[PDB]
From Swiss-Prot:
Catalytic residues as annotated in Swiss-Prot or TrEMBL: H68, D92, S150
Region of interest called NS3-binding, as start-end residue ranges on this chain: 2-11
Described purpose of this protein according to its UniProt entry: Displays three enzymatic activities: serine protease with a chymotrypsin-like fold, NTPase and RNA helicase. NS3 serine protease, in association with NS4A, is responsible for the cleavages of NS3-NS4A, NS4A-NS4B, NS4B-NS5A and NS5A-NS5B. The NS3/NS4A complex prevents phosphorylation of host IRF3, thus preventing the establishment of dsRNA induced antiviral state. The NS3/NS4A complex induces host amino acid transporter component SLC3A2, thus contributing to HCV propagation.
Binding-site positions, Zn(2+) 1: C108, C110, C156, H160
Domain Peptidase S29 as annotated: residue spans: 15-193
Reactions that this protein is recorded to catalyse: Hydrolysis of four peptide bonds in the viral precursor polyprotein, commonly with Asp or Glu in the P6 position, Cys or Thr in P1 and Ser or Ala in P1'; a ribonucleoside 5'-triphosphate + H2O = a ribonucleoside 5'-diphosphate + phosphate + H(+); ATP + H2O = ADP + phosphate + H(+)
Protein name according to UniProt: Serine protease/helicase NS3
Subcellular location: Host endoplasmic reticulum membrane
Highest taxon listed in the record's lineage: Viruses
Membrane topology designation: Peripheral membrane protein
Domain-related comment: The N-terminal one-third contains the protease activity. This region contains a zinc atom that does not belong to the active site, but may play a structural rather than a catalytic role. This region is essential for the activity of protease NS2, maybe by contributing to the folding of the latter. The NTPase/helicase activity is located in the twothirds C-terminus of NS3, this domain contains the NTPase and RNA-binding regions.
Cofactor binding notes: Binds 1 zinc ion, which has a structural role. The magnesium ion is essential for the helicase activity.
Binding partners and assembly: Interacts with protease NS2. Interacts with non-structural protein 4A; this interaction stabilizes the folding of NS3 serine protease. NS3-NS4A interaction is essential for NS3 activation and allows membrane anchorage of the latter. NS3/NS4A complex also prevents phosphorylation of host IRF3, thus preventing the establishment of dsRNA induced antiviral state. Interacts with host MAVS; this interaction leads to the cleavage and inhibition of host MAVS. Interacts with host TICAM1; this interaction leads to the cleavage and inhibition of host TICAM1.
Length: 193
């Protein structure tokens, strides 16, 4: 089974919109055959396997997502399934060559502490950065609000990408903070010998 693109999260600065591109049947077919003839576009994709769904974020020519969503699976593409370029279980990180037609977000170099997560439902969730990999939510959220958004982007006010959403700091079913793979750690992954 392959990972399939089933939609994209269109970013328009302050707001986002979730556009579905595959229904359940089409999604399953793309994952089964590993072949996807739709011309992809955008920077944030909605991804699905046979059993799960989550997000992927295009950065530095690679579409990144979480290992706990994609495993080591191939990505369905126009020429057939595409093997993962990066697979790091320790970081819960995987990457494929960015699908043709997509574009990459720019890594943030402005150091702003005011961040926002874009969820799979196109919700924008403000957060305040707390160290390298964490950001505290301005408003607590039920975990169901954030489920399915692993692999989505954490952004700065200028529309730069700061990190890739990995996990929620969550007790008693309420998320208080975000854990994300910082963009600098993606560059390290692309530099690791
Ligand atoms: C309690 C909780 C919120 C469920 C949990 N918090 C939590 O563990 O907090 C601690 C303390 C602060 C950071 C974190 O340190 C531990 C690191 C965990 C990890 F992430 F690195 C991780 N590495 C793995 C590597 C290999 C195999 C499996 C792995 N499994 C992992 O974590 C698991 C999964 C991850 C998850 O749910 N991610 C999200 C999501 O949407 N997934 S998903 O799309 O629906 C779906 C399941 C389809 C793919 C974004 C959060 C959303 F729900 F908000 N988890 C549990 C959590 O977030
Ligand atoms: Cl990391
Ligand atoms: Zn920035």
């Amino acid at each position: 089974g392959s990972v399939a693109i089933v939609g994209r999260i269109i970013l328009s600065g302050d707001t986002a919109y979730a556009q579905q591109t595959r229904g359940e049947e089409g999604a399953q077919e793309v994952s089964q055959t590993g072949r996807d003839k739709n011309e992809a576009e955008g920077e944030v994709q909605v991804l699905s396997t046979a059993t799960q769904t989550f997000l992927g974020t295009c950065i530095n020519g690679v579409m990144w997502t979480v290992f706990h969503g994609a495993g080591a699976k191939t990505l369905a593409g126009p020429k057939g399934p595409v093997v993962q370029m990066y697979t790091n279980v320790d970081k819960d990180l995987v990457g494929w060559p960015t699908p043709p037609g997509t574009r990459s977000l720019t890594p943030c170099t402005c150091g702003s502490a005011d961040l926002y997560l874009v969820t799979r439902h196109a919700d924008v969730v403000p957060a305040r950065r707390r160290g390298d990999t964490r950001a505290s939510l301005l408003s607590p959220r039920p975990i169901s609000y954030l489920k399915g958004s692993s692999g989505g982007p954490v952004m700065c006010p200028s529309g730069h990408v700061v990190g890739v959403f990995r996990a929620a700091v969550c007790t008693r079913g309420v998320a208080k903070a975000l854990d994300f793979i910082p963009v600098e750690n993606l560059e390290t992954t692309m530099r690791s010998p």
